[PDB]
Design a protein around this ligand. Sequence first.
Ligand SMILES: [Mn+2]
Ligand SMILES: [Mn+2]
Ligand SMILES: [Mn+2]
Ligand SMILES: [Mn+2]
Ligand SMILES: [Mn+2]
Ligand SMILES: [Mn+2]
Ligand SMILES: [Mn+2]
Ligand SMILES: [Mn+2]
Lengths: 439, 439, 439, 439
Amino acid sequence: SEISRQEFQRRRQALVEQMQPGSAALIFAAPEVTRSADSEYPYRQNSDFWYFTGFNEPEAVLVLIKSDDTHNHSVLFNRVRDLTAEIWFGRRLGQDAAPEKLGVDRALAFSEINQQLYQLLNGLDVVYHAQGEYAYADVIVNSLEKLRKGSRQNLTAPATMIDWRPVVHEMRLFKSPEEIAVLRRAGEITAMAHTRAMEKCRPGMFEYHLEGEIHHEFNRHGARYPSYNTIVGSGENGCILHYTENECEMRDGDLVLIDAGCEYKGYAGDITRTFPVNGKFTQAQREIYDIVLESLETSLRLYRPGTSILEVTGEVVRIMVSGLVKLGILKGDVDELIAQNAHRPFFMHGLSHWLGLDVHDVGVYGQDRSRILEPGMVLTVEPGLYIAPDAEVPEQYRGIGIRIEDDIVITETGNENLTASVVKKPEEIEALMVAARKQ
Amino acid sequence: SEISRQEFQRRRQALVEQMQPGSAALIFAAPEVTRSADSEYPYRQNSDFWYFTGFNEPEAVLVLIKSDDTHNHSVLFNRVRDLTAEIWFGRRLGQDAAPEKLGVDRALAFSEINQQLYQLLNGLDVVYHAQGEYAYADVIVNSLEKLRKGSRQNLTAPATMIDWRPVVHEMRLFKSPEEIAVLRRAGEITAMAHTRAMEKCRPGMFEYHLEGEIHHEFNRHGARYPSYNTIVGSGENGCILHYTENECEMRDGDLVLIDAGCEYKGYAGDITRTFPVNGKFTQAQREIYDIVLESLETSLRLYRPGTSILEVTGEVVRIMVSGLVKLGILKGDVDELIAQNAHRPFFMHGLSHWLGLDVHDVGVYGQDRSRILEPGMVLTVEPGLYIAPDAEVPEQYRGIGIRIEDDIVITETGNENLTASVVKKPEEIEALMVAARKQ
Amino acid sequence: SEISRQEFQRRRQALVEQMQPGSAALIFAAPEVTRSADSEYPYRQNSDFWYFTGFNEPEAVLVLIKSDDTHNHSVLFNRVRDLTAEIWFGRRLGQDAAPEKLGVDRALAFSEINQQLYQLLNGLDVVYHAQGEYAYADVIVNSLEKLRKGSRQNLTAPATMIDWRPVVHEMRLFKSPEEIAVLRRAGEITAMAHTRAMEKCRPGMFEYHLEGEIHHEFNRHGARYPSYNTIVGSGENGCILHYTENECEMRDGDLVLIDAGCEYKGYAGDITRTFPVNGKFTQAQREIYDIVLESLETSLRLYRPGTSILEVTGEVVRIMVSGLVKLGILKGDVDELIAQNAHRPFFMHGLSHWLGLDVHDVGVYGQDRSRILEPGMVLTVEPGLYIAPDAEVPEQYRGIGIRIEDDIVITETGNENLTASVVKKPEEIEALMVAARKQ
Amino acid sequence: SEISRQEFQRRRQALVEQMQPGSAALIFAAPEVTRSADSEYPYRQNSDFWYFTGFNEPEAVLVLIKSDDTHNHSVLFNRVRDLTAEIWFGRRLGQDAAPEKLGVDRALAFSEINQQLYQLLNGLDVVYHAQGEYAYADVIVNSLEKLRKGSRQNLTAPATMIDWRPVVHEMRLFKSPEEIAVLRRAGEITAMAHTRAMEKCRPGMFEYHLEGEIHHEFNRHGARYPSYNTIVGSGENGCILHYTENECEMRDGDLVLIDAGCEYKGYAGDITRTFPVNGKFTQAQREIYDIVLESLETSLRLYRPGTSILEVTGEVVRIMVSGLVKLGILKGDVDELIAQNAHRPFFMHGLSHWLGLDVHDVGVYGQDRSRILEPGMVLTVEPGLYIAPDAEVPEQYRGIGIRIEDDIVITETGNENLTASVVKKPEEIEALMVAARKQ
Ligand SMILES: [Mn+2]
Ligand SMILES: [Mn+2]
Ligand SMILES: [Mn+2]
Ligand SMILES: [Mn+2]
Ligand SMILES: [Mn+2]
Ligand SMILES: [Mn+2]
Ligand SMILES: [Mn+2]
Ligand SMILES: [Mn+2]
């Protein structure tokens, strides 16, 4: 599944629809980035620029001009076709093929941006620009100065600049059926990688070995890159939320927390599964795992239109405090403990965040993530309990870090879980591992 | 194999040895880099900062102070130990453990760099700084302005600034036995990945599938990342030197050029192998492959102390022109054709480049890469012939891109080939592929 | 005459009136400026910041907040009272006395601007800021980034930024009776300086001597500084529009063009008078002077509400071409010559420009300065003829540069000439000079 | 008197003499500076650029190239001759006339600086550049990056950058006989201005009136601009060291402290004289004035080769403490009071500073201004006593600010006072004022 040219065009029309007449929206591509000396990291297009073009080249600017309420057109600045630059670094779309290919009205060489942009903004009343996103973009836009100082040439600069991100990000917050299909495939690809990791894990292997298995699985399904740096934290490393070293050998008797997700057609998969390295939870590991699983299951039953992340979080907190008191990790009255946020040393992050072109996707959460949920919103559900190796708790719980994380989409009557194809019930994990351990 | 703390210390002493008395050398860590929004690319330490520390954290500065000819000491500025930043993002070395761990005399918090640096440069005569490398580094160093304007406080700024790169890069150009062992392991890891790719390749698979196989092989041996973006160009894509899209399905009857190398302990492996997708070279494919192979073999026999890349290139050019004339691709007198650089449309890059902490390693080449080779120098050997799909040559050669690339180390009496463990003779490639194709 | 605190307040209310509810206008002071090393030029406040405050200190920002349609208040950031900085450099208004003194509601220390500004813009919908005026102002305003990234702290940034200059400059274009009184005094002060210069001029004196006389006259009336760099161009120097060297000794038989105006209470006086150095126009000097004077007189009769600078310019051009044809300087048909802009080599600048807090005052001119004139507009009237020393014209006209420039205010039924108190009719100039030359 | 072309050439040769072979010194002109909107302050050339050229145009760079120990040449980048830019703003030297005029070997258009500079620095070992002086200069110099990255074009960048200021400023610290003649004329011009001010001062005049008299006197002698902003502090304003408002009406019975100096041929005059507004010192005014005068006279007797500013300051401090104890302003033992720096609340600045192309001239002072004085050094001598209007001292001394400041040149056997032509003994001041007050 993917996002076609037609949908990119619809998104552009939806923005223009919200734009004032006599205005221009400017959307810039991500700059290339250095890894070391003259080598660069694999190119990652800006999420917002991608959302409107599906074009993976740097040095490109999308210009949406709304002359009036009926008249509007698009202009793309992109790298010119160059034979020696292409023989060396790869093919370029160029200007001739851009209009038909992307669905834009015109295409100009990026090399001419400073000679053409001011001419496109001349006499407009508003310019929509995401100021402060990229320094090179700001330099180009600020160079407005030509218009401001060009009255003798009969040039006028738009006196209003509006940040298009709040509107674009609210658009991104609500997925189209096509986007949900893409995310559904990403969740499925990420689930297969996690299953594979569970089936490959053996005491003595290095944490990065599971990362290697996961990235090979992402790749074979057409998702070349992870949507974020893979986390493989065994033993004490599981208490580090974003532990990315993945350098320790995995110990017999320790749990391993895997946080990994692919990037398929620009969209993020986001899955976390914690399981025993030897295929068998110990009693103390199983006791913490149960609290985190109930937190997840209860959340999955509750998430729906009408509720909110904040509301569902209160349910998880009560589940957590209850279990921590029962195990002896917390001491006191449940309601009193809840009132003093006593769960915080063991659960210090949020239960959810939006999911889309970015793993921590754009969109307003409302204070304390209280915004009412509506169909089309995609988010993660990732309770966790992390007992520090030196926490003042019963000895057998120290160094246990557990998180169990799925990706869901709010539907008309609940939510659809995009990553339930990888097991999370302890007996199922053990059963899965036991079958793999026998060949 | 690896580079221990002792060797990092020796390198620091070797720099100090070359430094003037009453001076300070400043070496900055690479800044973290954004991939998208709030997600960052996997951290890659600056090669020069790594060369002297083996420390993989950002926001760190190595300060080597040479008080006089007998007295010198080191100061490291690095991120302070922070409990909440570590619970979230990972462990930090901190200041207490830095001296013993890295072998530096003192360690100060990076947060105090602007309050301490000027005090360290006060009254020195020279400051060695790689100006223009990183903007943040330049801002810190330029803020010298405190010393210049602080005469009333009895402060004086060094009036001389020397770029330490020419000296450090000349150091990097000559590998220690330990570095050669690391590169030898990197060449071996990269060769196993290429062998694996040859054995997995089947018509119909996508170019990125081979990239997935290669990166999984790098990973299992402890080389998490490639030293450069993997190139898998089948058919016409083989004529694009650094084709990294790797998006086309591989065709029965086409050749596939794979350019890939791992990064092991900071060092680059750099291997290219071109072979038939179906396990069998066609006559026309075999005819071009032979010219490129002879170019490589002859070069491997010749490379040694006393010669140069330029000198060996002349040998390759004659081999190329000779074969292109014999095949009908070039027309005329060999010596006349050589004199007019007639091979250039088919071989447009250099035969070698240095290899080390960077795939295109630092070090002076001499005009036209004429510097006399000496033991300890590591370089690649990567003749290639690329016949454009529209080249005015016999129809059967169009769209053929071939490159065969090994990594070598110049020794006292020749060179040691670090990547010969992956086959390159056509019968050997076919034999290898034929055995894999039967299971 | 001057502009009191009440008027500065009215101007602030008039801006707020035009502002949208839920917005803030930011107006920054001019930065101090270096003359050489550690010495600075005499401080000149930004015209727009002055227009709203009458406050002559650097490091100050005026913040006008419009909470809604009925509620609005002002906050001033200004240098804190410091005993040692004041003993050395001068008194500072400080925060305690600012509210009453300037008429603002609150005053905060400039040192706290970055800790307070974002708090003042939090939750507003619009921020009016003159982007690109001062780099330091832009850095402060862009540091919006705190609001954008502070959603977890419940902070929101205004998504709209509007340039307040077009509105403020349109305000500045129309003078209040008080401003016209100030400009009237400035025109009178500048006229006395020009009269003094005419009465002091003697062959052999240096051009800068007249500049010295002029600046001494400005000073004695309370106008310490010129509104622009004084121009004293004798002989060939008169053909250089903004000749400011004023280094040549004045020759018997040459004309001297003086362009000078004071800055009184922030407003510009702008007067040009050209006269013979020896007190007597030669026939050739008198013949060119007559054309320029008729151009000025005709313009002074015509300027009124309903007409425009462009319209009056056409009248001047016909006068010029007519006289140049009659003298032999131009050859051909008057109407044909006018049609080919044949006067341009001799009159290459505009006839008028606005006058106010800046000598070349803000305000839209309309294409080709065609905007219809209205009461309250202040402008200059400064025809000129400059015959280059090598111009292909009758020998006796070469090296003659003449300009005669007055400042006027458009009234309900014409214009009031603010600088007619300094003579411009040749017989009057000669009469004036002849009387001075006898003591 | 002035500095001719030959001397500018000698200075350039003296720098080249101290430069290493295979190097280039870069000296940039001061950028033009905005006063308001499109009007600029009168141009002030950078002191160091002036010191080597005597050229008063912006957008110019002096390049001194020392090929070896015998071979060296100069290249000047300066604004090209442009007919329309000159008709409007003034004449430009241009490239054709530059070599002969300034005495440089070649002159190139400033517009070509980025295409030519790197070519001039190619292959050199050292570049002398005053980093951080001007941002535009740094941008030009840093754009070295072309050389660093141009090895394939056979370009090499100098690896050493040396700040030429310490050497140039040490040169500037020692005046040539010609420079001393210029400073002698500047001191004489400034003394006539101060005499004029004393003779014009009358109760009721405004402080800025004396500033007007002073600047008119500077001007008539060919010193158009002050070397620093004129200070005219009457009454309590005299206790503000650099009071430049000069806005108060001068009161009968108050003292007026005038700090003013001209800028003649680039050099600074620097004189301070404090006298009664009504021509008669009161007893309390006379008692403080005597302490400051003795401090000055004693210093003038002492200043010579072999001593230092620090040494002479100790003499002044004893004189001050002695007189303050005798008047009742200080209480205690003189030696004890001196030991606790009890004079500091009344004398808080230094006794001297260097004088030359900058009023606070370049040159190393040594810790606490202890550098041994040598012939050729020019400095000021400006003891002062400032009793705050609220100081806990006898009522009659409050609000008295007095400073008496001369400019001297250290000679072989003492010093020559360059500004003694304006009276400083109280009876002489009164006598001077009394004669002027009668007409
Ligand atoms: Mn996750
Ligand atoms: Mn997540
Ligand atoms: Mn390669
Ligand atoms: Mn290579
Ligand atoms: Mn004028
Ligand atoms: Mn004018
Ligand atoms: Mn002074
Ligand atoms: Mn002084």
